[PDB]
Every structure is written in structure tokens, then in C-alpha cells.
Design a protein around this ligand. Sequence first.
Ligand SMILES: CCCCNc1ncc(-c2ccccn2)c(N[C@H]2CC[C@H](O)CC2)n1
Ligand SMILES: [Cl-]
Ligand SMILES: [Cl-]
Ligand SMILES: [Cl-]
Ligand SMILES: [Cl-]
Ligand SMILES: [Mg+2]
Length: 243
Amino acid sequence: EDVVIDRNLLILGKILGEGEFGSVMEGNLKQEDGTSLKVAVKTCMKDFSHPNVIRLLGVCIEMSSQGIPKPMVILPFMKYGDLHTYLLYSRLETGPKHIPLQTLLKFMVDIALGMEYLSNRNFLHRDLAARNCMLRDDMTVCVADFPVKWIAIESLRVYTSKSDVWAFGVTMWEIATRGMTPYPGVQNHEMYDYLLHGHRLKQPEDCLDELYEIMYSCWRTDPLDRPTFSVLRLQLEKLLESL
Ligand SMILES: CCCCNc1ncc(-c2ccccn2)c(N[C@H]2CC[C@H](O)CC2)n1
Ligand SMILES: [Cl-]
Ligand SMILES: [Cl-]
Ligand SMILES: [Cl-]
Ligand SMILES: [Cl-]
Ligand SMILES: [Mg+2]
């Protein structure tokens, strides 16, 4: 209840994208200090506080004409949008400049730092992917939105933090390939058999051997054999310093 906001401080606009239970609308939130803030409205998070984890600005429950409730979650606006679509733009003219290797690692580290936070609070993401990572105006990444080619083999139906590491591994692959779909040539219904027979995501063309080892360690068959987010973050931070 301490999260709720009076709708009269909210103005909706265009549609930014399509979400799970409905569409996401841009909007203006009139802040306490009287100013107006650009926000995103989707049409457990308030306890989260971390720069690489999406913050919740509040919630609105607009009543309809018939009285059926229309809940709305107020989130920050990020002009650079989801990270998946950003990777695709970068390899085109007009879009963002060619993303260097170092910057790509900074994305991975940010995500790693964000998952380290949620994993310390023993919170499972259950849907980590490059599409669910947003780029702030300072080009830092934050996790949000908490599908077969991202799910861990053991979960194909048990889920732990080590499954988030699996998804994190795939996300690293998405980033290193600048927006490729996982498992080219393989179809969704073949994934369990494909993984069960020991096959994993192949190494990208220009990717570093020591960067592939890190993301490969995310797909070890035994979840307990996989590294924690704290180990992963430091490995990426150290690989980044060696450039
Ligand atoms: C995780 C979503 C938080 C909302 N913030 C935001 N800000 C700007 C854009 C944005 C920025 C540029 C262009 C379009 N949308 C955006 N797109 C959504 C991303 C997720 C998707 O499921 C729905 C749309 N979200
Ligand atoms: Cl409105
Ligand atoms: Cl945020
Ligand atoms: Cl962009
Ligand atoms: Cl592959
Ligand atoms: Mg999403």
C-alpha cells in the first residue's frame, strides 16, 4: 500500500512494446518535488535496491468505466530500450556505433552484478535473457521482467539460482554474437535431446577462449558444478581489466 500512487499524477502516451499481461505505455509521472518524470507503465520489487536492478517507481490502479480494475506498475524509462534490440541496431548504420568487446563485457558485468544482488537475497529471476535487460541513459544495464532455449536442462521441472546462471550463460552468448538466436539449426522441440546428448552452445567467431570458458561453465550438467554469480562477476571484471 505504501507503494501505491494517485493516478492523477500519471499521464499515459504511446505504446513502447508488448508485455506479458498487456502492453507497455510511455508516460509522465508527476513527482513529489512537483517536477515531471518520464516513465514506463506496464498495463516484491520495492524491496530491491541496486543500480543494476530495475527500480519500482510505484503502482496505480485505475478504475474502468464499468468498475473492473486496471492495475499499472510504474517503472523508469530507458531510451536505449531492451538490450537485445540494441545489439541488432549496433550492427547497422543509423543505429548505435559498433560496440567494442570491452563494452560488451561491461554489459555482462552489469548483469552479473545485478544477479549477484538478487541471488544474495535468494531471489530467482526465472526469465533472464538479453531481451529482459534494459539500457539506462548512462549505457549501464539493469535486469527486469521477473523460452525453451534459455531454460536449464535440469529444469526441463525444478528451478534454483544455478538455473539463473544457465540463462546468464545464454545471455552472454547473445551479447558475444550481438543478437543471434541460441542454437542455430536446432528447433525448440529438439532442445532436451540436444542438451542431454552433451551438446552446448558453440563458441562465437571472434569470441575469446577465456570468455567462452566462463559462459561454458554456466552450462555444466550438474547445477552444483556451476559457478555462482559472485564468481562470474569477478571473472568478467578480471577479463575486462586484461584488455
Ligand atoms: C523491462 C521494461 C521496463 C520498462 N522501461 C522501458 N523503457 C523504454 C522502453 C523502450 C525504449 C525504446 C523503444 C521502445 N521501448 C521499454 N521497452 C519495453 C521493453 C520490454 C518489452 O517487453 C516491452 C517494451 N521499456
Ligand atoms: Cl492518462
Ligand atoms: Cl531502474
Ligand atoms: Cl538504440
Ligand atoms: Cl550453437
Ligand atoms: Mg520482456
